[PDB]
């Protein structure tokens, strides 16, 4: 009753538990986060960097992606890095299920009231917009099967004309769209066009991700980002 592609993707999807353990292990020292109050900008930047590293590791193990040459792999990730990070954050909130706070991959909970106090207008806007998307996805009853399929769809969202291996990626794109459509129609028949609604949510994720890139660019110009930051490397798209 579940498409093969989704069954395979579920087998590659880590437990929110292990990802947390992995990242906290790569992150953690002492000065902020622990203490709570106030909030470490540099630490959160490293946390986001480590989250993307976890995402890259997932991609490397993925069917199809693992068959591509490094050049094609880099091009795909350069096109979807921000969207994968935003979707990751949003799904974490969907499962968290709290409208007055946000859950970080490290397990840290941040009150939205705290964001209103500490964040500038741009970031505050981003956080609030992501929460609106969380509400939409909660109402749509987004489940794990759909989430992993959406991640795969985002990973291969690039037009094949930008890659060396066209046939392989083209088939993956068709398979992913077919799987999400089939799964949603069979498991949520009373949500007429859940498939289309999820695709529209991806349009929203893309718009939000662009705004996130603008936030990062602002930080970059102000020399506020840690040196050798991976997200900034991705923002520069020069690899």
């Amino acid at each position: 009753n579940v498409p093969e592609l989704i069954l395979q993707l579920l087998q590659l999807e880590p437990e929110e538990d292990q990802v947390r353990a992995r990242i906290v292990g790569c992150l953690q020292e002492p000065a902020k986060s622990r203490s709570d109050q106030p909030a470490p900008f540099s630490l959160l930047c490293r946390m986001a960097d480590q989250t993307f590293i976890s995402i890259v590791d997932w991609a490397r193990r993925c069917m199809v992606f693992k068959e591509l040459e490094v050049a094609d792999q880099m091009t795909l990730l350069q096109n979807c890095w921000s969207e994968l990070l935003v979707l990751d954050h949003i799904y974490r909130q969907v499962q968290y299920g709290k409208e007055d706070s946000i859950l970080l991959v490290t397990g840290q909970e941040v009150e939205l009231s705290t964001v209103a106090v500490q964040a500038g207008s741009l970031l505050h806007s981003l956080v609030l917009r992501a929460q609106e998307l969380v509400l939409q996805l909660h109402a749509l009853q987004l489940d794990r099967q759909e989430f992993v399929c959406l991640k795969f769809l985002i990973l291969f969202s690039l037009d094949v004309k930008f890659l060396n291996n066209h046939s392989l990626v083209k088939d993956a794109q068709e398979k992913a769209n077919a799987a999400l459509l089939d799964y949603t129609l069979c498991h949520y028949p009373h949500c007429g066009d859940k498939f289309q609604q999820l695709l529209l949510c991806l349009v929203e994720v893309r718009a939000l991700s662009m705004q996130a890139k603008e936030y990062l660019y602002h930080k970059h110009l102000g020399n506020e980002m840690p040196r050798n930051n991976l997200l900034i490397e991705m923002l520069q798209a020069k690899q």
């Binding site: 890259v56 490094v70 880099m74 990730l77 350069q78 050798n228 991976l230 490397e233 020069k238 690899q239």
Partner: peptide, 12 residues
């Protein structure tokens, strides 16, 4: 052309 991304994908 060494980049962080490249080191993550080229097993090294």
């Amino acid at each position: 052309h060494p980049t962080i991304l490249y080191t993550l994908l080229s097993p090294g």
